[PDB]
């Protein structure tokens, strides 16, 4: 059963690594969403400043 | 920050698992052929890794998920209706009078 | 038994067909989902009325 | 014909030299030469090329349709199909008024000849070419739904009707609200024929809330159809909102008195009395092009009575069920329950051994992944809703008036 | 089923793209049969009203399919099966007609199981379009209960982690801004 | 039966054995059902308001 123990430990390690990679992908997605929100905010600010310069 | 905290916790557990696996491999190669109660309990815990849930536990988990998901839907509805109220207030100034 | 239940001293009812006294164990631990539902419905009708009046 | 040749040469020069706006204003110019001179436009068609040369041809095509001397429709329809297939309408969005009138004349000719089956496909192509996004509603949609209704072919509309189009096209100021009124009335009828009473009622409600200084027959019939669907689906007339409309509301209610009378007896909940009223007002509902809706109202009343029995009974016999809802026998009640269970309206069970029907509550304990998936789908719809609302709010912020008030 | 839906969509597109405005009789026959398969009675009824009487007179098979559709609307299963197996269906209609016959069996089988806690053997036999006796062994092998004395039949009524994570990330992204 | 139709008895009639069984519906199931109905109505009203905004912005009205 040493082989079975090694297989179980390898499966646990692979699952942990997969969850870690998923968490990192969530990091990237959340950062991208924050960047998109910041881009929308800066676009709104630029539009407001352009209209202020127009008048 | 929330999932970074969970990431750190999972990293700690993964490091512990890596240490256990390395010890098992070393024992298979050299070290103590059988460290007695230690490898016994390690194998027992690896045999309790499946855990095995019953219909009731899965039902309760789905129940909590559905409840808090309905709460999330209510929160999204509140945010959407606030956005709608802001849009209506702006529209009533854009063209509408009174 | 009927007098005691009608006096709110007994939290249960009576099964006269089988000569049985069933008491409500009230183990659900709820009474908060009712408040959540009341809040949800009242404030959503409130929002609908506000939107209809403002539009 | 000399002027027409000059116009063709002018169109060719503006197209070959990259004069997008000059060609657009030339088409939008007087064009009296195209109006008075005819019998030479076929030569213009062959001589002129495709892409934006065909855009000038489209104006030439629109000129032909504007005259009662429209040429052989066999050759005309093939040329229209060739133009649509080889369409490069990168600038047709500027001349939306001409294209809208072309579709209206084509639809009127289709109704005159009673051949609305083929016009659905052509008008489907027409909407795709001119519209900017899938959330834009135009006048061609009203004619498209009319062709589907006359041809009794609701299959193509349902895809294009299941999308909410929150951007009306002014058609360069030529968009009359009659097209808007016709589209929702025709769209509601299409949904009604597909037993989609919820969307049909929604479309009828939107047509009701259209602000109008004058009441029209199309609006009047839309209100009447709204009552019929409300009686079928909800069992009662849904109250009109308070964002409302104009005198449309004021004038129609006295006018559509009979449908309110039908609703009043429907509220009394008596199929026998309701049937007697229908027989009394048979000719009153006959000018509807449909009498089945009244029969559907009666069936809905029977279904509503059966549904009300579930909320009050756990196990009821077929004989008692038939007596309560006034049926001819237990077999009819057995069939009615079976059909409603097939449609997914009732959760109950019948026991033929004892002649009993056992009603049951909702078997949904909200513990299955299906409810979670439905909630997540509604969540995605709500997030798309909020994104559209934020985009519209930003577009509002772009306006001059709010900035002037802010500055 | 999936191929039938694909065939229906192709036939639906051909009707819209009809050159002369009328489809070939095989297309109309396939369209009507496929509507009956999906129990889309409204579309089948409206298509039948759309078909000119010239095709109906020149193709008596089209009227036979409509007669079956009327039987399906009335939901008289013994009549439905009799009408299905009475008229000879061409090579383009025989396979889809049998699929409709199978669809009716499954529908009526589910209708009895859901609605009927108890049902007479003759009534169940009529509903499924089979004689009584082998219908009994068909449902006993289905794990149901049957009473021989009263001839009554007692039917027995019967998200991945990645998607969840994506939905929760969408929750947070929507509620963060 | 009349009292159940009017209310304030909260019961179901079992005409088979002629026994009146009281109704104790789960609060959560009804809450979820009416919350889903509320969400559907809110989506419908949002669509209605968006259409109203579209027709008002584009100046669409019967002359």
Swiss-Prot record, chain A:
Residues 23-55 form a coiled coil. It is found in: Cytoplasm; Nucleus. Belongs to the CSN7/EIF3M family. CSN7 subfamily. Component of the COP9 signalosome complex (CSN), a complex involved in various cellular and developmental processes. The CSN complex is an essential regulator of the ubiquitin (Ubl) conjugation pathway by mediating the deneddylation of the cullin subunits of SCF-type E3 ligase complexes, leading to decrease the Ubl ligase activity of SCF-type complexes such as SCF, CSA or DDB2. The complex is also involved in phosphorylation of p53/TP53, JUN, I-kappa-B-alpha/NFKBIA, ITPK1 and IRF8/ICSBP, possibly via its association with CK2 and PKD kinases. Component of the CSN complex, composed of COPS1/GPS1, COPS2, COPS3, COPS4, COPS5, COPS6, COPS7 (COPS7A or COPS7B), COPS8 and COPS9 isoform 1. In the complex, it probably interacts directly with COPS1, COPS2, COPS4, COPS5, COPS6 and COPS8. Interacts with EIF3S6. This is COP9 signalosome complex subunit 7b. It comes from Homo sapiens (Human). The chain holds residues 166 to 220 of 264 of the full protein.
From Swiss-Prot, chain B:
Residues 1-98 are annotated as: Interaction with Vpr. It is found in: Nucleus; Cytoplasm; Cytoplasm, Perinuclear region. GO terms for cellular component: COP9 signalosome; cytoplasm; cytosol; nucleoplasm; nucleus; perinuclear region of cytoplasm. The keyword Cytoplasm applies. Keywords: Cytoplasm, Host-virus interaction, Nucleus, Signalosome. One of its GO terms (biological process) is protein neddylation. Its main location: nucleus. Widely expressed. Belongs to the peptidase M67A family. CSN6 subfamily. Component of the CSN complex, composed of COPS1/GPS1, COPS2, COPS3, COPS4, COPS5, COPS6, COPS7 (COPS7A or COPS7B), COPS8 and COPS9 isoform 1. In the complex, it probably interacts directly with COPS2, COPS4, COPS5, COPS7 (COPS7A or COPS7B) and COPS9 isoform 1. Interacts with the translation initiation factor EIF3S6. Interacts weakly with RBX1. Directly interacts with COP1 and 14-3-3 protein sigma/SFN. Interacts with ERCC6. (Microbial infection) Interacts with the HIV-1 protein Vpr. This is COP9 signalosome complex subunit 6. The gene is COPS6. The chain holds residues 219 to 316 of 327 of the full protein.
Curated annotation (Swiss-Prot), chain E:
InterPro entries: COP9_CSN8 (IPR033205), CSN8_PSD8_EIF3K (IPR033464), PCI_dom (IPR000717). It is found in: Cytoplasm; Nucleus. It holds the Pfam family CSN8_PSD8_EIF3K. GO terms for biological process: activation of NF-kappaB-inducing kinase activity; COP9 signalosome assembly; negative regulation of cell population proliferation; protein deneddylation; protein neddylation; protein phosphorylation; regulation of protein neddylation. Keywords: Cytoplasm, Nucleus, Phosphoprotein, Signalosome. Residues 1-158 form the PCI domain. GO terms for cellular component: COP9 signalosome; cytoplasm; cytosol; extracellular exosome; nucleoplasm; nucleus; perinuclear region of cytoplasm. Belongs to the CSN8 family. Component of the COP9 signalosome complex (CSN), a complex involved in various cellular and developmental processes. The CSN complex is an essential regulator of the ubiquitin (Ubl) conjugation pathway by mediating the deneddylation of the cullin subunits of SCF-type E3 ligase complexes, leading to decrease the Ubl ligase activity of SCF-type complexes such as SCF, CSA or DDB2. The complex is also involved in phosphorylation of p53/TP53, c-jun/JUN, IkappaBalpha/NFKBIA, ITPK1 and IRF8/ICSBP, possibly via its association with CK2 and PKD kinases. This is COP9 signalosome complex subunit 8.
Curated annotation (Swiss-Prot), chain F:
Transmembrane segments: none annotated. Widely expressed. It comes from the Eukaryota. It is found in: Cytoplasm; Nucleus. Essential component of the COP9 signalosome complex (CSN), a complex involved in various cellular and developmental processes. The CSN complex is an essential regulator of the ubiquitin (Ubl) conjugation pathway by mediating the deneddylation of the cullin subunits of SCF-type E3 ligase complexes, leading to decrease the Ubl ligase activity of SCF-type complexes such as SCF, CSA or DDB2. The complex is also involved in phosphorylation of p53/TP53, c-jun/JUN, IkappaBalpha/NFKBIA, ITPK1 and IRF8/ICSBP, possibly via its association with CK2 and PKD kinases. Component of the CSN complex, composed of COPS1/GPS1, COPS2, COPS3, COPS4, COPS5, COPS6, COPS7 (COPS7A or COPS7B), COPS8 and COPS9 isoform 1. In the complex, it probably interacts directly with COPS2, COPS3, COPS4 and COPS5. Interacts directly with inositol kinase ITPK1. Interacts with CAPN8. Interacts with USP48. Interacts with ASB4; this interaction negatively regulates GPS1. The PCI domain is necessary and sufficient for the interactions with other CSN subunits of the complex. Mediates the interaction with CAPN8. Belongs to the CSN1 family. This is COP9 signalosome complex subunit 1. The chain holds residues 405 to 467 of 491 of the full protein.
